Design a protein around this ligand. Structure first.
Ligand SMILES: */C(=C\S(=O)(=O)c1ccccc1)[C@H](CCc1ccccc1)NC(=O)[C@H](CCCONC(=N)N)NC(=O)N1CCN(C)CC1
Length: 215
């Protein structure tokens, strides 16, 4: 695989978001992934809707949590692959209350055909990411509350409790790391991102990695 890849530098990643006071991390992980996959299939980088999933995806639980692999299955099996634009279905759950699902008046921003569940293997995830783009991952982020910067090498790695987006890695650094996009505003971490060390299943990062497929 390449020594280092940063999809932000390649213009594949939209701005860091704020999930607010709502456990909608899984929707920000899954939508961030679809945004990147849609741009990498040759479309313009387009802002897509987490509210679609928080309100309409009833296989997940809204502000009380979900799975990115369920979100991708809902989009494909129940919504004919469609993911609406943010502008036409804006986020409304930042105080913890999701409006009811609305079907009409929203504009499709991207379409996906399926998703792939990647191996529980950091080297294979990195090689996949270098060729195919950012990857949604579940992590244990319980020890992330004090993180301000640097490469984390003591992440508590016990229970998957959060969903985030792998946007790159660097195997050349003194401590090899993953670059992760979080959804806790740009004030948190390194302008909204965290680096965790790569190769020791920090935060259980290898355990539930996946991506939407475009085309
Ligand atoms: C988002 C995490 S967060 O940003 O709120 C957070 C992370 C770490 C520390 C503090 C806060 C949500 C929070 C869901 C929530 C909200 C209120 C109370 C209880 C739970 N986390 C998830 O959506 C989480 C994502 C990881 C999925 O991992 N994969 C597997 N476990 N296979 N999923 C869940 O929390 N749920 C909850 C129960 N379900 C119905 C779905 C999965």
């Amino acid at each position: 695989a390449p020594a280092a890849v940063d999809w932000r530098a390649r213009g594949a990643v939209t701005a860091v978001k704020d999930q607010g006071q709502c456990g909608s991390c899984w929707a920000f992980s899954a939508i961030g992934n679809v945004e990147c996959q849609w741009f990498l299939a040759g479309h313009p980088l387009t802002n897509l809707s987490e509210q679609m999933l928080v309100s309409c995806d009833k296989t997940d639980s809204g502000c009380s949590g979900g799975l990115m692999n369920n979100a991708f299955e809902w989009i494909v099996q129940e919504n004919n692959g469609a993911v609406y634009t943010e502008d036409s279905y804006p986020y409304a759950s930042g105080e913890g209350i999701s409006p009811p699902c609305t079907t009409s008046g929203h504009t499709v921003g991207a379409t996906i055909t399926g998703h792939v569940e990647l191996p529980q293997d950091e080297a294979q995830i990195a090689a996949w990411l270098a060729v195919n783009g950012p990857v949604a991952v579940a992590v244990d982020a319980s020890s992330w509350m004090t993180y301000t910067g640097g490469v984390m090498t003591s992440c508590v790695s016990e229970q998957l409790d959060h969903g985030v987006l792998l946007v790159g890695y660097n195997d050349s650094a003194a401590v090899p790391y993953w670059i992760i996009k979080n959804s806790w505003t740009t004030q948190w971490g390194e302008e909204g991102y965290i680096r965790i060390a790569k190769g020791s299943n920090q935060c259980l990062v290898k355990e539930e990695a996946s991506s939407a497929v475009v085309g």
